[PDB]
């Protein structure tokens, strides 16, 4: 007859929570931890403390140079990352082109503050006139031009040969930037400058530049055919910038102090601000995880898990769940 | 199955222990009872939370995209750039993949190894003072009860004590 | 042998057996005949094939070389090109070098397992209507025969039609 | 007695076939699978539909401006992808040198389809002489001329100032080719036009070129101490080109539409055409394989599969197979 | 232990052992002695050993960095050069540091599996003219000595040589 | 009554060594294998048979033009490799900037055997004057020059043009620079080389180029407000270099002959020569190991293990040994 028993077996439970395995799939177990983050907001937050600068239909040479379709930018100081679109609208209003402009903005993906300041006003340009503007760069139906960079032609009937410097007296490396106009023939260039065969010159402790206007028949860019070529450099604490010309130079004005260096980015997004904050964030949203892994995209800013193109990463904890 | 035990000769699990992963159910003259072995279940818990752990630890440290911009005359360093990136990103989703697939299978029969070294150790103890019929079970051929239940358990058995009673018993049915 | 069956204690293997991988040799009053287990040799068809496809698809998506020309004042970028795409062809090749090594050794082994299990599920059905000989076969103290055998291969075996005949011939011996 | 028996075996059979473990080698298994494609047809065939290009002993830059030792492809159209042998012999017959020679190959390397038209006829130069020609461009041992664009010398003896345009009146992206030529001092340079200090200048929308011979004194290249220097780009639909000059202006012909673009390759090869078929083309030899690896070359085109180092790869499938 | 053998139910090593890594401890009507396996320590060193040496050549070749040098204007590409070298580093730390793990764990517990496979190989010799006490251990039911000591261990063991006499002293205790 | 036993067990001993896995750290093992190696001898030692070329405060640039306080290696022939400091006191005395540096410098770390050799004598200068010198390259408070580069200036108040060339009569392929001098003003270019619109001419069969002086206005480095510009080219075998000028021509005294390519480096690296011998040697001192890794740093030449990132690195060779 029947005695006494006992018995060996092991945990079961009503979950239909399944793993992977690399002999056998979807395999039914009792307990099991997803690490994979599948979910964002799908907004572009400030970054801690600290709010991005969303550069709306304005590109950064627009935002730096100071096309007038952009004047809502004319005093940004401090930013957690940068935000600019595919293919913003409002750049180099002037038509040209912008000289080692993806190595600026490298530049510009490390630094998170910029304080502008005036470092030759306007009121200096006694012998020359400083109201060179175009319909291409208009405001409001009537012909403007960049903020931050002026446009000298002759006054009078003489344009003088130019000769100003400035040294930078602060501790924070400077950034200058300037121009030239390539004019459409001799008549033209004789009228906008007087003198015919000219040169813009720039000089600090490492930069040697010499630039020369280049007539050529051109097709039309925003009705325009003239051209104007920028260029930056970085001055350091305690040098002096010097130019010369006798014509073609769109001189600078305002410059930007580098004030904060610190790590950043310039996201490519067609969002909007979201009003809301973040430790995580991606061009298509932010992220509010503790997943060691995250698939919503590559290029991340802040503190973030892992980026993989898995859709699915769960770890067995428990085992075999049989029906 | 890698080691028998689990959906092999202990077919089904129980619905009825909660208490943890691995344990008992007695059955005596008094009464019944699931039980779970905590000693076992707890070491289980350790070993599978050092593992998440690990897995995560050897994963703080890999690549990390950046944006970066080219003009229309520099393609071929812009394919080398979009190269590398896809190139390592391909490289951390194969090794996040397979980690997890490979580790998966090793907890599985961790678990079924688990189970085996349980009922063996019952079953080492017991020997002759009881029957396996097979299904993860030992009919005892003495009369076992709630407090020789947590004998075999604690390991604390005292075979002798019981050893000579169910040497009569067992051998009641050959005679 | 991770498990000690192939190569253990079954020794040697059977080149009779040609139907699958793990099976049966039987011996009764009738005959004799090499019998492949069906249920056992399928569910390791299953798995060895899931994973060949499954090396496979981890390893479709990975790094691809495209040739690119450097000029002869270019050859920093023209040496980091070389670099990278000598870098994932060896990544990947270590990737795959391992990975076969890694599941080669997993698949013997589960093999070795399945044999093992196998072996365990008879023995733990049989029990004492029968004698292990520790060479991977069983002495019938009781007479089985050709629907004997298919008893204990499809589990469908009704142990107490012959729980007393055995125990009579076992003690024969003793007394 | 004995009485009946039931054993518990495995299966074994004659199989020499071997795998590899970490912990042994060369393990004999009953069964074992392959997955390492190792062998190739040592052709280059077509890629599905499609016939190769086959350079022969011409490069690119031969092909695309009309070497005489080419003119077998004056009239290329479609190709699966392009063979170039490592060091072709025919290139630029006229010794200087092609202006971003790898950025175009690389652009070449996504297109399949040129259609090359008429973008500027001889007979348009009334007033210049198109005549220009030399014995290292030579074809049957009597002096020629790239086929593709056109050397301009004085009429008479005269050189007017040149200003022609193109319009690219197509919906495809248009390669256009020209060049400027470098004598080697004054009298030479009067010689051929007439006017003595030239420039040449292109315009685009995006373009704004200027260029200037540079003479000096340079060691000789098929007996040639002269030099030209060639440029291209691209120019986009609706869009105008503009050329100015007053002499050394290496005119353009005939350009080139883009009228496919697709996944393409440009691959070093020795080898000749191959007359024969496959879904997967390298350098030295077609691939026909459902192997996941092989191990033949890295640079493959078409549907491959993943190219390893390894010498071996092989998979146990069956068990360990006993002597 | 994933074996249960090691800890397990044989609970303690031994320092006495110097010999080897697996071996026996007998005790007779002679004397006692540890005694070292040979043949089976020996194919634990030649695996252990062909593994040290295929983790080895599996890392002979990798990524290999080397000094380059780039100027102020070129900081696009000197970022890429110090990703893709960080990069292929951190690769190959991610891929040793893990193997090293995967290859320990499988060590000890090839060590467990052949600490298991020594025991049940002397188990299934014996049978039932010995006592499986449940530590490592058989008491011998008739009487084993310095050559019958040496018959289990080669596997030479004549079984029905010793078959009869344990088979009265085994059935004396319980009739 | 008891009786014979017999034992299955296995070894133990006093270890204290440790190894981890996936599951469970610091797991205490009878036998254990580093393969780490985690031990240098801080010091910069030949390789193999040779000796290092070590520049203590000279850069590459002062060293191959001859900067005055680099005479030391007025003369070096053959290294092993090449240690150069992070930021070097001593390279273009005369200020200014080395054209193509790096590339020249990953050049430089194929190359491990150069000759030095006269290519044009400052006697052939029969009508210039070879004395251009300088305070910023100074030797004992005394101004002085480069020593391998010669600055030409105006000879009584002349300066004719120079046409001169050299033929590579070698089968080594030769090093030469050569540069530029920017003035800093009209009268400052007459005063030195009389001629006022100036050249440099510079032709092989592959070179074409020419170089103009840029007169601007610079802030002072050193002193100095001019600038010297540099350039490189190899000139191969059978080959002839060209130079012609009419002034700001630094010219040629010596070149390299490039006697033996092979593998080599230029590491960063403060350390001295440790007068000391190895096979594997990085820029923060060598290695004598046969572990299969290190880590101590990811620059290193010579047959070395490979580098990882881990602090630790042990296999478990023997067993769980138990308390
Ligand atoms: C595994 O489960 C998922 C989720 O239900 C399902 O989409 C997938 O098809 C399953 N796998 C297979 C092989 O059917
Ligand atoms: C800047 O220019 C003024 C005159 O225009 C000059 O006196 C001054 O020295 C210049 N500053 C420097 C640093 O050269
Ligand atoms: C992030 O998620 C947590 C829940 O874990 C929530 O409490 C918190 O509010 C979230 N943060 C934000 C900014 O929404
Ligand atoms: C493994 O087999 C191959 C093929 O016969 C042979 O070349 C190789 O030497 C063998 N391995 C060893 C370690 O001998
Ligand atoms: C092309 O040139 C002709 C005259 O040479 C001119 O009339 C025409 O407007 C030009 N086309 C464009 C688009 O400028
Ligand atoms: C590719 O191989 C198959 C055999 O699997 C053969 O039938 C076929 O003809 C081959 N293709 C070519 C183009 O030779
Ligand atoms: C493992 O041992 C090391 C060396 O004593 C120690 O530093 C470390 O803290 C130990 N691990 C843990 C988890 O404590
Ligand atoms: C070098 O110059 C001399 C005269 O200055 C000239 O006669 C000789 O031919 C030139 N050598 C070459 C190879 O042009
Ligand atoms: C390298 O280490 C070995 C010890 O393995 C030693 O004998 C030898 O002298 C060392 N080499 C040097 C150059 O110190």
């Known amino acids: 007859d029947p005695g006494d028993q006992i018995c060996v077996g092991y945990h079961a439970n009503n979950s239909t929570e399944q793993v992977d395995t690399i002999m056998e799939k979807n395999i039914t177990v009792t307990h099991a931890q997803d690490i994979l983050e599948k979910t964002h907001n799908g907004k572009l937050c400030n970054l801690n403390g600290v709010k991005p600068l969303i550069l709306k239909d304005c590109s950064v040479a627009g935002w730096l140079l100071g096309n007038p379709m952009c004047d809502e930018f004319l005093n940004v100081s401090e930013?957690?990352?940068?935000?600019?679109?595919?293919?913003?609208?409002?750049?180099?209003?002037?038509?040209?082109?912008?000289?080692?402009?993806?190595?600026?903005?490298?530049?510009?993906?490390?630094?998170?503050?910029?304080?502008?300041?005036?470092?030759?006003?306007?009121?200096?340009?006694?012998?020359?006139?400083?109201?060179?503007?175009?319909?291409?760069?208009?405001?409001?139906?009537?012909?403007?031009?960049?903020?931050?960079?002026?446009?000298?032609?002759?006054?009078?009937?003489?344009?003088?040969?130019?000769?100003?410097?400035?040294?930078?007296?602060?501790?924070?490396?400077?950034?200058?930037?300037?121009?030239?106009?390539?004019?459409?023939?001799?008549?033209?260039?004789?009228?906008?400058?007087?003198?015919?065969?000219?040169?813009?010159?720039?000089?600090?402790?490492?930069?040697?530049?010499?630039l020369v206007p280049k007539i050529a028949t051109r097709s039309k860019v925003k009705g325009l055919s003239g051209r104007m070529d920028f260029f930056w450099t970085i001055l350091k604490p305690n040098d002096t910038i010097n130019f010369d010309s006798n014509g073609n130079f769109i001189a600078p004005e305002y410059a930007y102090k580098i004030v904060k260096k610190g790590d950043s980015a310039i996201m490519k997004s067609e969002l909007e601000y979201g009003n809301c904050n973040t430790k995580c964030q991606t061009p298509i949203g932010a992220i509010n995880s503790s997943m060691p892994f995250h698939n919503i995209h590559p290029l991340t800013i802040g503190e973030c898990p892992k980026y993989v193109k898995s859709n699915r990463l769960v770890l067995a904890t428990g085992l075999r769940n049989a029906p | 199955?890698?080691?028998?035990?689990?959906?092999?000769?202990?077919?089904?699990?129980?619905?009825?222990?909660?208490?943890?992963?691995?344990?008992?159910?007695?059955?005596?003259?008094?009464?019944?009872?699931?039980?779970?072995?905590?000693?076992?279940?707890?070491?289980?818990?350790?070993?599978?939370?050092?593992?998440?752990?690990?897995?995560?630890?050897?994963?703080?440290?890999?690549?990390?995209?950046?944006?970066?911009?080219?003009?229309?005359?520099?393609?071929?360093?812009?394919?080398?750039?979009?190269?590398?990136?896809?190139?390592?990103?391909?490289?951390?989703?194969?090794?996040?993949?397979?980690?997890?697939?490979?580790?998966?299978?090793?907890?599985?029969?961790?678990?079924?190894?688990?189970?085996?070294?349980?009922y063996?150790?019952?079953?080492?103890?017991?020997?002759?003072?009881?029957?396996?019929?097979?299904?993860?079970?030992?009919?005892?051929?003495?009369?076992?009860?709630?407090?020789?239940?947590?004998?075999?358990?604690?390991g604390t058995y005292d075979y002798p004590q019981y050893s000579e009673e169910a040497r009569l018993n067992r051998e009641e049915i050959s005679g």
């Open chain 1, 79 to 210: 930013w957690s990352y940068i935000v600019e679109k595919a293919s913003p609208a409002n750049g180099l209003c002037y038509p040209g082109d912008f000289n080692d402009y993806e190595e600026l903005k490298h530049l510009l993906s490390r630094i998170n503050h910029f304080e502008k300041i005036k470092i030759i006003p306007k009121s200096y340009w006694s012998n020359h006139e400083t109201s060179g503007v175009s319909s291409a760069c208009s405001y409001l139906e009537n012909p403007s031009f960049f903020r931050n960079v002026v446009w000298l032609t002759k006054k009078d009937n003489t344009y003088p040969p130019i000769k100003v410097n400035y040294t930078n007296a602060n501790q924070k490396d400077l950034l200058v930037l300037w121009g030239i106009h390539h004019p459409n023939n001799e008549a033209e260039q004789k009228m906008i400058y007087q003198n015919l065969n000219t040169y813009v010159s720039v000089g600090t402790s490492t930069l040697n530049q010499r």
């Open chain 2, 120 to 154: 063996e150790k019952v079953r080492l103890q017991l020997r002759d003072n009881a029957k396996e019929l097979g299904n993860g079970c030992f009919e005892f051929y003495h009369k076992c009860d709630n407090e020789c239940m947590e004998s075999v358990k604690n």
């Open chain 2, 1 to 118: 199955g890698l080691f028998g035990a689990i959906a092999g000769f202990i077919e089904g699990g129980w619905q009825g222990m909660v208490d943890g992963w691995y344990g008992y159910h007695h059955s005596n003259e008094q009464g019944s009872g699931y039980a779970a072995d905590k000693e076992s279940t707890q070491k289980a818990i350790d070993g599978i939370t050092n593992k998440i752990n690990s897995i995560i630890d050897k994963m703080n440290t890999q690549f990390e995209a950046v944006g970066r911009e080219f003009n229309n005359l520099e393609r071929r360093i812009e394919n080398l750039n979009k190269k590398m990136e896809d190139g390592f990103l391909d490289v951390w989703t194969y090794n996040a993949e397979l980690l997890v697939l490979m580790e998966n299978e090793r907890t599985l029969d961790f678990h079924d190894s688990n189970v085996k070294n349980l």
